Amino acid sequence: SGFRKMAFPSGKVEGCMVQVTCGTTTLNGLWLDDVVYCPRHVICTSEDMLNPNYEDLLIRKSNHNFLVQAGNVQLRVIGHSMQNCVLKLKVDTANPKTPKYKFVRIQPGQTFSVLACYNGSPSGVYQCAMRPNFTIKGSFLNGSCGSVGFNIDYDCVSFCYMHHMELPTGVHAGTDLEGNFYGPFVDRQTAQAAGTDTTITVNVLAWLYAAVINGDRWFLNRFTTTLNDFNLVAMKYNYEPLTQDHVDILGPLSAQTGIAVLDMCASLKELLQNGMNGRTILGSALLEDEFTPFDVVRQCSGVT
Amino acid sequence: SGFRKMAFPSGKVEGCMVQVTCGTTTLNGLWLDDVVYCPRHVICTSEDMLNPNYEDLLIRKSNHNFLVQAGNVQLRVIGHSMQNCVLKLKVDTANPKTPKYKFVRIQPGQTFSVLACYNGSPSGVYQCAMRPNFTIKGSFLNGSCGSVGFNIDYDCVSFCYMHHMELPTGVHAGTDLEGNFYGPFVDRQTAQAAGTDTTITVNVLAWLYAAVINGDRWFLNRFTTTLNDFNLVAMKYNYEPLTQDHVDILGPLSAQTGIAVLDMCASLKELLQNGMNGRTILGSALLEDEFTPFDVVRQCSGVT
Ligand SMILES: Cc1ccncc1NC(=O)[C@@H]1CCOc2ccc(Cl)cc21
Ligand SMILES: Cc1ccncc1NC(=O)[C@@H]1CCOc2ccc(Cl)cc21
């Protein structure tokens, strides 16, 4: 019992973190096999960031200009290439701590752990969701660029995020490990619209199931709803419309608790329309949307 | 910018986790140097737990009855001893992944990371506080016993908690690494009073400073208070009385923000008396007490 915003154990990712320096700029890199991946803005000065021509800036750099370090290990750079907004620095040594890994592009609404790093050193780990508007609400300061997001299935680390930027609004933006930004963002110092965000309905419902499993049940009611009725309420409250695919993903939680998905939707509808009335659910005074139905199943069953 | 419930990177602790089996019972152990530490109830059956005589139960066990495994590594047990509620199994091999470590007894109100484990395998990591009543509100299922809590300062892991039990109320209880329970708890299947808990005032104030640092300022007001006046409000709302030692620990945050500690106390007083009025602070709709002033300084400065 108990339900926490749990992150994946970060050890396999800690063994991949390196410091990458180019000129006056230092950030984090991810060393997998004989390649170090890092944000391409490592080649920029603060002045360059207003409107960088990355192709031109990278042409003035050679392999020896990229200093890659992992504590007492200095890596020898034998190749460099830019792929979208990431640099791939080929090194002469394969990382002996390379875990089994994959590079994945996660969907909005999915969750992942972030290993926040500074100067190639891990500072902390936290769980977060990729918002529907493709931003993340992380905890990042200058120097955290290159810190990565990931998920772990058994012995395989699926890297899904690399940190690049903080928007003027304080929210965060980054790329997949092929350097493609999530969202409309560009890697330049310009004000950029994140766009309207919404609450991840399927995740709030998964978290309400987690609440019932762990004993928080005060929000259960004698009502039911339909997908159409619930979606009129979701519209009013800036929630993502619920689809049958979402209902389908909630199947295991509905089966375990015996609470029909649309019955749980009626509870969510009443909480949206009336608020919490000064009460809490799983230690929260708001409707939590950073737990996917898969996260709930995993945490409630103790998967390792 | 951004502020998250961040846990320490768990890698150094993952390398210490082992599975300990004794008879029909399997739980987690912590392998440091040539000793494996685990809850002494590993020697009990479910029937034994109603009123176990641990000394008698342990007398029926020999070194070869404790099966210690770390994946493909089976450890050879050459000694066993009980220290309070923990067993210390001497093994013939020192853990090659032993980090620099210390065993510490944390104070109530302090925070730490928990690496939740099952069958010797890490499942997740989360940050939590030791409640003033010496319980923790974790996320633990059967088999998570032996999972540990810790803090990290540079390269040293200070182990402060080992998980033992879930109270009938769903909250958790455990020991320091010398096997002394935090709180009045005993390791037996009996209903046990946790006692009145309180909110960690100094931590809520530290978190209000973190909010101001990250741009959430709506709660700042034109008021001030005294320690005496604030403590009358703290009493009414089941908050820990604020002392000059607490004010002293908030000094760095007061200096950084320019907001006097008693001025921040007046903001906390108004939030206690009026609530949040449907607003949020750092993504929370309640007053968060799981961040110490040290946690705020560390996260806001990116310490690794
Ligand atoms: C300061 C900070 C904090 C948290 N995360 C990231 C940062 N850093 C940035 O955003 C840097 C500095 C500012 O200008 C830009 C512009 C574009 C890009 Cl891709 C990077 C950056
Ligand atoms: C089931 C569970 C869940 C989470 N954390 C822990 C547990 N396990 C327990 O509490 C076990 C089983 C029940 O009886 C007792 C009694 C005393 C002690 Cl020390 C241990 C236990």
XYZ file of C-alpha atoms and ligand atoms in Angstrom:
650
model
C 0.000 0.000 0.000
C 0.852 3.638 -0.597
C 1.248 5.328 -3.965
C 4.171 7.542 -4.888
C 5.446 9.526 -7.900
C 8.077 6.872 -8.474
C 10.965 7.179 -10.897
C 12.883 4.292 -12.483
C 16.155 3.355 -10.728
C 18.694 5.651 -12.415
C 21.843 3.519 -12.141
C 21.951 2.295 -15.731
C 21.680 5.923 -16.932
C 24.193 7.341 -14.420
C 26.862 5.102 -15.998
C 26.256 6.812 -19.355
C 26.589 10.441 -18.247
C 29.556 12.461 -19.414
C 30.514 16.151 -19.515
C 30.894 17.707 -22.964
C 32.700 21.011 -23.340
C 33.143 23.014 -26.526
C 34.853 26.355 -26.146
C 33.212 28.229 -23.259
C 30.106 25.963 -23.147
C 29.797 22.872 -20.940
C 26.790 20.546 -20.810
C 25.871 16.842 -20.368
C 26.307 14.107 -22.907
C 25.056 10.524 -23.070
C 27.745 7.945 -23.825
C 26.291 4.761 -25.383
C 28.604 2.274 -27.114
C 31.237 4.498 -28.926
C 28.984 7.558 -29.399
C 28.314 10.549 -27.132
C 25.013 12.345 -27.781
C 24.523 15.927 -26.657
C 22.529 19.061 -27.526
C 24.018 20.733 -30.576
C 23.955 24.128 -28.799
C 27.137 22.975 -26.945
C 28.914 24.670 -29.928
C 27.306 28.074 -29.217
C 28.309 30.975 -27.074
C 25.469 32.858 -25.245
C 25.602 35.506 -28.031
C 25.236 32.809 -30.753
C 21.941 31.590 -29.255
C 19.865 34.555 -30.505
C 19.852 33.165 -34.087
C 22.421 30.364 -34.514
C 23.410 28.957 -37.890
C 24.378 25.552 -36.454
C 25.830 24.297 -39.752
C 28.233 27.267 -39.933
C 29.067 27.141 -36.233
C 29.862 23.404 -36.398
C 32.141 23.932 -39.459
C 34.522 25.951 -37.231
C 34.845 22.959 -34.847
C 37.049 19.914 -35.144
C 37.074 16.616 -33.170
C 39.682 17.986 -30.717
C 37.425 20.967 -29.813
C 34.897 18.641 -28.088
C 36.220 17.786 -24.651
C 34.446 14.691 -23.331
C 35.054 13.622 -19.763
C 33.603 11.033 -17.371
C 35.391 11.830 -14.084
C 38.960 10.539 -14.505
C 38.247 9.271 -18.068
C 38.979 11.673 -20.915
C 37.423 10.399 -24.141
C 39.194 10.683 -27.492
C 36.870 12.141 -30.163
C 37.352 10.595 -33.586
C 34.240 11.870 -35.391
C 31.447 14.412 -35.092
C 28.140 14.814 -36.847
C 24.985 16.762 -36.329
C 21.649 14.900 -36.541
C 18.760 17.385 -36.213
C 19.397 19.244 -32.858
C 21.876 16.703 -31.452
C 25.561 16.179 -31.952
C 26.911 12.637 -32.109
C 30.555 12.498 -31.112
C 32.177 9.261 -32.115
C 34.708 8.217 -29.471
C 37.480 5.573 -29.662
C 36.190 3.689 -26.584
C 32.859 1.959 -26.169
C 31.238 2.759 -22.809
C 31.820 -0.346 -20.659
C 28.714 0.597 -18.654
C 26.433 0.707 -21.749
C 23.163 -0.908 -20.766
C 20.790 -2.645 -23.222
C 19.056 0.374 -24.713
C 16.690 1.714 -27.367
C 15.911 5.212 -28.606
C 12.168 5.860 -28.592
C 9.918 8.810 -29.390
C 7.288 8.888 -26.647
C 3.737 10.038 -27.142
C 2.280 13.093 -25.368
C 0.679 11.983 -22.094
C 3.316 9.272 -21.516
C 5.589 9.426 -18.484
C 9.328 8.992 -17.948
C 12.124 9.534 -15.429
C 14.593 12.382 -15.789
C 18.111 12.075 -14.400
C 19.003 15.725 -13.854
C 22.724 16.291 -14.362
C 25.222 19.170 -14.144
C 28.807 19.024 -15.521
C 28.307 15.333 -16.346
C 27.336 14.521 -12.731
C 23.920 13.265 -11.626
C 22.111 15.510 -9.141
C 18.707 13.811 -8.897
C 15.956 11.760 -10.465
C 12.267 12.507 -10.880
C 9.238 11.246 -12.750
C 7.293 13.467 -15.108
C 4.928 13.403 -18.049
C 5.362 14.729 -21.523
C 2.492 17.271 -21.540
C -0.083 17.090 -24.372
C 1.542 20.337 -25.659
C 4.967 18.579 -25.799
C 6.587 20.513 -22.977
C 7.714 18.998 -19.683
C 7.383 20.613 -16.265
C 10.824 19.624 -14.995
C 13.430 20.959 -12.650
C 16.359 22.203 -14.673
C 18.915 24.978 -14.253
C 21.660 26.288 -16.607
C 24.056 23.400 -17.278
C 21.333 20.701 -17.075
C 21.156 20.561 -20.910
C 21.878 17.080 -22.156
C 20.175 15.464 -19.124
C 17.947 12.628 -20.412
C 14.524 11.122 -19.888
C 13.972 7.384 -20.050
C 11.853 4.336 -19.168
C 13.107 0.867 -18.175
C 11.604 -2.494 -19.148
C 13.510 -5.325 -17.370
C 17.167 -4.714 -18.438
C 16.498 -2.309 -21.359
C 16.601 1.483 -21.067
C 14.446 3.283 -23.628
C 15.773 6.816 -23.916
C 13.023 9.204 -24.950
C 14.161 12.698 -24.019
C 17.223 14.940 -23.997
C 16.899 18.336 -22.327
C 17.593 21.415 -24.405
C 15.774 24.492 -23.294
C 13.771 26.453 -20.814
C 10.969 28.493 -22.334
C 10.411 32.069 -21.067
C 7.391 30.605 -19.169
C 9.593 28.306 -17.043
C 8.530 25.068 -18.763
C 10.977 22.770 -20.529
C 11.593 21.606 -24.082
C 13.785 19.000 -25.600
C 14.256 16.354 -28.187
C 14.134 12.616 -28.784
C 17.633 10.970 -29.055
C 17.647 11.584 -32.829
C 17.545 15.336 -32.012
C 13.976 15.985 -33.115
C 12.210 18.445 -30.819
C 9.037 17.357 -29.150
C 6.615 20.127 -30.106
C 7.119 23.178 -32.291
C 10.260 24.335 -30.530
C 13.497 25.465 -32.115
C 16.856 25.671 -30.377
C 17.263 29.445 -30.348
C 16.759 32.226 -27.776
C 13.441 33.477 -28.999
C 10.035 33.557 -27.202
C 8.140 30.481 -28.410
C 4.493 29.558 -27.922
C 4.009 26.167 -26.233
C 0.307 26.149 -27.115
C -2.712 25.137 -25.101
C -2.134 22.305 -22.727
C -4.788 19.903 -21.437
C -5.099 17.484 -18.534
C -4.307 13.832 -19.386
C -7.733 12.297 -18.729
C -6.675 8.638 -19.037
C -3.887 9.270 -16.453
C -6.238 10.980 -13.960
C -8.584 7.950 -14.285
C -5.625 5.558 -13.810
C -4.662 7.502 -10.655
C -8.266 7.348 -9.356
C -8.038 3.536 -9.750
C -4.686 3.637 -7.817
C -6.496 5.640 -5.105
C -9.286 3.029 -4.775
C -6.669 0.219 -4.690
C -4.854 2.001 -1.834
C -7.992 2.839 0.172
C -8.910 6.379 -0.905
C -12.528 5.835 -1.968
C -14.516 8.883 -0.748
C -14.882 10.110 -4.389
C -16.744 6.963 -5.551
C -20.389 7.681 -6.211
C -23.679 6.021 -7.249
C -23.455 7.504 -10.765
C -22.409 6.516 -14.235
C -21.826 8.451 -17.473
C -21.263 7.865 -21.187
C -18.173 8.732 -23.267
C -20.244 11.501 -24.930
C -21.501 13.027 -21.647
C -18.103 12.746 -19.966
C -16.447 14.439 -22.975
C -18.765 17.470 -22.695
C -17.426 17.852 -19.081
C -13.828 17.150 -20.258
C -14.240 19.923 -22.878
C -15.459 22.430 -20.228
C -12.541 21.613 -17.918
C -9.747 21.465 -20.533
C -9.296 17.680 -20.255
C -8.286 15.480 -23.191
C -11.373 13.774 -24.756
C -11.614 10.162 -23.602
C -11.637 7.551 -26.351
C -12.359 3.813 -26.423
C -8.561 3.284 -26.794
C -8.171 5.026 -23.389
C -11.006 2.866 -21.912
C -9.212 -0.198 -23.327
C -5.892 0.783 -21.659
C -7.796 1.125 -18.334
C -9.159 -2.467 -18.669
C -6.721 -4.090 -16.220
C -7.485 -1.482 -13.518
C -11.233 -1.801 -14.083
C -10.901 -5.629 -13.871
C -8.788 -5.533 -10.683
C -11.114 -3.112 -8.842
C -14.443 -4.167 -10.323
C -15.226 -0.501 -11.085
C -16.434 0.023 -14.661
C -14.422 2.681 -16.540
C -17.529 4.831 -17.187
C -18.436 4.584 -13.460
C -14.946 5.929 -12.682
C -15.573 8.627 -15.351
C -18.719 9.655 -13.363
C -16.565 10.050 -10.242
C -14.092 12.183 -12.258
C -17.021 14.202 -13.685
C -18.317 14.915 -10.125
C -14.798 15.867 -8.907
C -14.411 18.216 -11.917
C -17.807 19.818 -11.300
C -17.560 20.067 -7.479
C -13.837 20.077 -6.662
C -12.260 18.140 -3.781
C -14.224 20.023 -1.017
C -11.032 20.373 1.033
C -10.245 16.646 0.858
C -7.274 14.766 -0.643
C -6.674 11.705 -2.832
C -3.323 9.918 -2.419
C -1.885 12.944 -0.596
C -2.903 15.327 -3.409
C -5.425 18.187 -3.324
C -5.714 18.215 -7.141
C -6.389 15.653 -9.873
C -3.014 14.087 -10.711
C -2.288 13.283 -14.374
C 1.363 12.101 -14.251
C 0.608 8.382 -13.808
C -0.272 6.308 -16.873
C -2.457 3.167 -16.509
C 0.784 1.165 -17.094
C 2.517 3.071 -14.245
C -0.351 2.231 -11.915
C -0.293 -1.514 -12.827
C 3.525 -1.602 -12.371
C 3.575 0.207 -9.021
C 0.558 -1.686 -7.660
C 2.190 -5.050 -8.580
C 5.854 -4.274 -7.668
C 7.422 -4.895 -11.100
C 11.248 -4.732 -11.133
C 13.513 26.882 -12.970
C 10.914 24.334 -11.931
C 10.784 22.479 -8.631
C 10.299 18.742 -8.324
C 10.121 16.072 -5.590
C 13.588 14.916 -6.560
C 15.251 11.766 -5.288
C 19.002 11.110 -5.137
C 20.424 9.115 -8.081
C 19.991 5.503 -6.927
C 22.908 3.845 -8.736
C 25.250 3.538 -5.766
C 22.449 1.829 -3.788
C 21.299 -0.441 -6.645
C 24.773 -2.039 -6.621
C 24.245 -3.041 -2.978
C 20.867 -4.768 -3.315
C 20.650 -8.506 -2.844
C 17.874 -11.059 -2.283
C 17.880 -12.858 1.069
C 15.850 -16.021 1.501
C 15.404 -18.023 4.687
C 13.043 -20.956 4.472
C 9.813 -19.787 2.819
C 10.556 -16.044 3.305
C 12.327 -13.867 0.728
C 13.152 -10.178 1.150
C 15.836 -7.576 0.261
C 19.233 -7.237 1.830
C 21.899 -4.537 1.634
C 25.386 -5.817 0.827
C 28.119 -3.432 2.061
C 31.726 -4.644 2.294
C 31.433 -8.330 3.512
C 28.124 -7.915 5.394
C 24.513 -8.232 4.211
C 21.958 -6.369 6.342
C 18.306 -7.362 6.266
C 15.168 -7.290 8.434
C 15.352 -10.007 11.061
C 11.792 -11.138 10.201
C 13.331 -12.935 7.152
C 13.580 -15.896 9.622
C 9.805 -15.937 10.274
C 6.943 -17.676 8.601
C 3.622 -15.711 8.331
C 2.367 -17.657 11.402
C 5.494 -16.685 13.425
C 4.784 -12.964 12.940
C 1.893 -12.826 15.448
C 4.329 -12.949 18.417
C 7.848 -13.952 17.302
C 10.603 -14.884 19.731
C 13.392 -13.827 17.344
C 16.162 -15.210 19.573
C 14.575 -18.689 19.547
C 13.709 -18.543 15.856
C 17.275 -17.531 14.917
C 18.742 -20.399 17.029
C 17.125 -22.895 14.608
C 18.986 -21.268 11.671
C 22.533 -21.817 10.512
C 24.688 -19.881 7.986
C 23.636 -22.223 5.140
C 19.913 -21.468 5.749
C 20.363 -17.843 4.551
C 20.397 -17.836 0.770
C 21.932 -14.591 -0.490
C 21.836 -13.843 -4.187
C 22.684 -10.877 -6.426
C 21.526 -12.068 -9.872
C 24.120 -14.627 -11.012
C 26.182 -14.203 -7.791
C 25.384 -16.563 -4.927
C 27.018 -15.337 -1.721
C 28.604 -17.719 0.780
C 27.410 -16.980 4.342
C 30.110 -17.422 6.960
C 28.476 -15.731 9.966
C 25.140 -14.444 11.219
C 24.165 -12.170 14.057
C 21.128 -10.249 15.107
C 21.550 -6.567 16.057
C 18.217 -5.164 17.304
C 15.691 -5.843 14.426
C 18.315 -6.490 11.729
C 20.321 -9.522 10.788
C 23.925 -9.075 9.691
C 25.065 -11.925 7.483
C 28.803 -12.037 7.130
C 29.730 -13.154 3.611
C 33.107 -14.352 2.245
C 33.171 -11.702 -0.523
C 33.263 -7.949 -0.118
C 30.798 -6.196 -2.443
C 32.936 -4.790 -5.282
C 30.263 -2.121 -5.825
C 30.390 -0.886 -2.184
C 30.209 2.885 -2.293
C 31.666 5.194 0.394
C 28.941 4.962 3.014
C 27.826 5.797 6.549
C 24.959 4.576 8.711
C 22.994 7.495 10.142
C 19.893 7.888 12.294
C 17.885 10.708 10.726
C 15.738 13.119 12.663
C 11.949 13.341 12.217
C 11.162 15.943 9.547
C 14.280 15.059 7.513
C 13.944 13.694 3.990
C 15.533 10.800 2.106
C 15.239 8.694 -1.047
C 13.844 5.175 -0.958
C 14.943 2.596 -3.517
C 11.952 0.259 -3.532
C 13.039 -3.311 -4.240
C 11.427 -6.743 -4.682
C 13.375 -10.056 -4.706
C 16.646 -8.096 -4.583
C 15.721 -6.099 -7.718
C 15.135 -2.342 -7.809
C 11.662 -1.287 -8.957
C 11.760 2.477 -8.365
C 13.036 5.450 -6.424
C 11.155 8.183 -4.599
C 11.754 10.962 -2.113
C 9.936 11.092 1.197
C 10.128 12.514 4.688
C 10.361 10.771 7.993
C 7.106 12.056 9.561
C 7.282 13.736 13.000
C 5.549 10.556 14.314
C 8.393 8.398 12.867
C 6.357 6.724 10.151
C 6.935 7.174 6.425
C 4.234 7.453 3.775
C 5.932 5.231 1.204
C 4.947 2.884 -1.551
C 5.680 -0.649 -0.455
C 4.108 -4.039 -1.124
C 4.832 -7.516 0.351
C 8.445 -8.383 -0.499
C 9.672 -4.749 -0.323
C 11.061 -5.366 3.206
C 14.757 -4.645 3.333
C 14.451 -1.773 0.810
C 16.500 1.174 2.143
C 16.327 4.926 2.529
C 19.388 7.096 2.056
C 20.905 10.521 1.326
C 24.011 11.266 -0.771
C 26.673 13.903 -0.091
C 29.201 13.963 -2.991
C 30.420 10.306 -3.157
C 29.119 9.132 0.262
C 25.799 7.350 0.785
C 24.335 7.810 4.262
C 21.897 4.972 4.831
C 19.174 6.003 7.250
C 16.275 3.609 6.765
C 15.490 -0.055 6.167
C 11.869 -0.986 5.495
C 10.208 -3.460 7.818
C 6.495 -3.081 8.108
C 3.196 -1.730 6.970
C 0.920 -0.597 9.775
C -2.802 -1.499 9.591
C -3.338 2.186 8.593
C -1.276 1.822 5.389
C 1.706 3.861 6.622
C 5.212 2.439 6.881
C 7.681 1.676 9.654
C 11.270 0.670 9.709
C 14.620 0.929 11.328
C 17.994 2.635 11.102
C 20.815 0.332 9.773
C 21.606 -0.786 13.343
C 18.060 -2.258 13.450
C 16.548 0.268 15.839
C 12.973 1.145 14.895
C 12.136 4.738 14.241
C 9.181 5.328 16.558
C 7.509 3.007 19.039
C 7.080 0.155 16.591
C 7.875 -3.494 17.156
C 8.353 -6.098 14.447
C 5.253 -8.188 15.099
C 1.780 -8.485 13.534
C -0.114 -6.479 16.076
C -2.086 -3.199 15.640
C 0.267 -0.409 16.733
C -0.478 3.258 17.356
C 1.666 5.612 15.246
C 0.599 8.609 17.336
C -0.364 12.109 16.330
C 1.459 13.440 13.349
C 2.078 17.114 12.573
C 3.030 19.133 9.509
C 6.761 19.959 9.216
C 6.566 23.757 9.475
C 10.214 24.475 8.592
C 9.817 22.349 5.402
C 6.598 24.119 4.319
C 8.435 27.468 4.773
C 11.434 26.136 2.790
C 9.027 25.095 0.001
C 7.356 28.545 0.037
C 10.854 30.029 -0.512
C 11.351 27.523 -3.420
C 8.007 28.740 -4.827
C 9.089 32.418 -4.725
C 12.456 31.490 -6.325
C 10.611 29.726 -9.173
C 8.016 32.470 -9.727
C 5.005 31.385 -7.656
C 4.485 34.514 -5.545
C 0.696 35.076 -5.303
C 0.772 34.030 -1.589
C 3.182 36.835 -0.566
C 1.427 39.490 1.461
C 1.981 42.860 3.192
C 2.014 41.216 6.642
C 4.464 40.020 9.228
C 4.147 37.920 12.398
C 6.154 36.900 15.462
C 7.292 33.390 16.472
C 4.715 33.525 19.311
C 1.790 34.613 17.087
C 2.721 32.189 14.310
C 2.935 29.328 16.846
C -0.636 29.976 18.057
C -1.720 29.434 14.378
C 0.643 26.413 14.046
C -0.982 24.912 17.182
C -4.516 25.375 15.734
C -3.523 23.749 12.434
C -1.438 20.848 13.815
C 1.887 22.274 12.581
C 5.177 21.787 14.429
C 6.030 24.888 16.559
C 8.641 27.020 14.805
C 11.833 27.651 16.752
C 14.798 29.987 16.255
C 16.806 26.888 15.157
C 14.271 26.488 12.296
C 14.549 30.245 11.466
C 18.347 29.815 11.465
C 18.169 26.871 9.002
C 16.003 29.071 6.707
C 18.695 31.834 6.706
C 20.151 31.023 3.271
C 16.684 31.059 1.639
C 15.749 34.304 3.391
C 19.088 35.838 2.249
C 18.689 34.671 -1.372
C 15.095 35.949 -1.715
C 15.269 38.975 0.565
C 12.090 37.785 2.329
C 12.431 37.802 6.124
C 11.557 34.434 7.716
C 8.770 35.966 9.854
C 7.344 37.671 6.719
C 7.227 34.218 5.087
C 5.603 32.927 8.325
C 2.848 35.587 7.831
C 2.230 34.231 4.321
C 2.026 30.680 5.763
C -0.310 31.951 8.523
C -2.648 33.509 5.882
C -2.570 30.309 3.753
C -3.395 28.234 6.874
C -6.260 30.543 7.843
C -7.711 31.048 4.327
C -6.607 28.021 2.288
C -5.355 28.191 -1.310
C -8.672 29.606 -2.737
C -8.489 27.148 -5.641
C -4.930 28.160 -6.566
C -1.678 26.152 -6.640
C 1.938 26.578 -5.519
C 4.587 24.617 -7.451
C 1.892 22.376 -8.956
C 0.442 21.535 -5.518
C -2.991 22.396 -4.095
C -1.795 21.800 -0.508
C 1.104 22.974 1.661
C 4.007 20.616 0.910
C 6.245 19.568 3.822
C 8.588 17.006 2.183
C 11.346 19.473 1.233
C 13.864 20.524 3.883
C 15.616 23.935 3.628
C 18.755 21.951 2.598
C 16.776 20.198 -0.188
C 15.611 23.558 -1.497
C 19.169 25.045 -1.501
C 20.517 21.905 -3.264
C 17.816 21.752 -5.943
C 17.837 25.517 -6.546
C 21.659 25.473 -7.006
C 22.050 22.164 -8.945
C 24.366 20.358 -6.496
C 25.673 16.989 -7.762
C 18.882 28.335 -18.407
C 18.303 26.949 -18.532
C 17.538 26.406 -17.506
C 16.956 25.166 -17.671
N 17.085 24.430 -18.782
C 17.826 24.937 -19.772
C 18.461 26.178 -19.698
N 19.239 26.691 -20.763
C 18.756 27.238 -21.898
O 17.562 27.283 -22.169
C 19.820 27.826 -22.825
C 20.207 29.237 -22.345
C 19.151 30.232 -22.751
O 18.948 30.258 -24.182
C 18.775 29.033 -24.784
C 18.105 29.048 -25.999
C 17.902 27.861 -26.682
C 18.406 26.690 -26.158
Cl 18.250 25.216 -27.067
C 19.080 26.663 -24.954
C 19.255 27.842 -24.232
C 2.657 -6.469 3.406
C 3.675 -5.357 3.419
C 3.497 -4.224 2.632
C 4.402 -3.186 2.715
N 5.469 -3.198 3.523
C 5.656 -4.285 4.278
C 4.802 -5.389 4.260
N 5.024 -6.527 5.071
C 4.768 -6.612 6.394
O 4.376 -5.665 7.066
C 4.985 -7.999 6.997
C 3.750 -8.881 6.731
C 2.641 -8.523 7.686
O 3.041 -8.672 9.067
C 4.237 -8.087 9.410
C 4.396 -7.782 10.754
C 5.577 -7.207 11.189
C 6.591 -6.984 10.281
Cl 8.115 -6.364 10.844
C 6.447 -7.288 8.943
C 5.249 -7.828 8.480
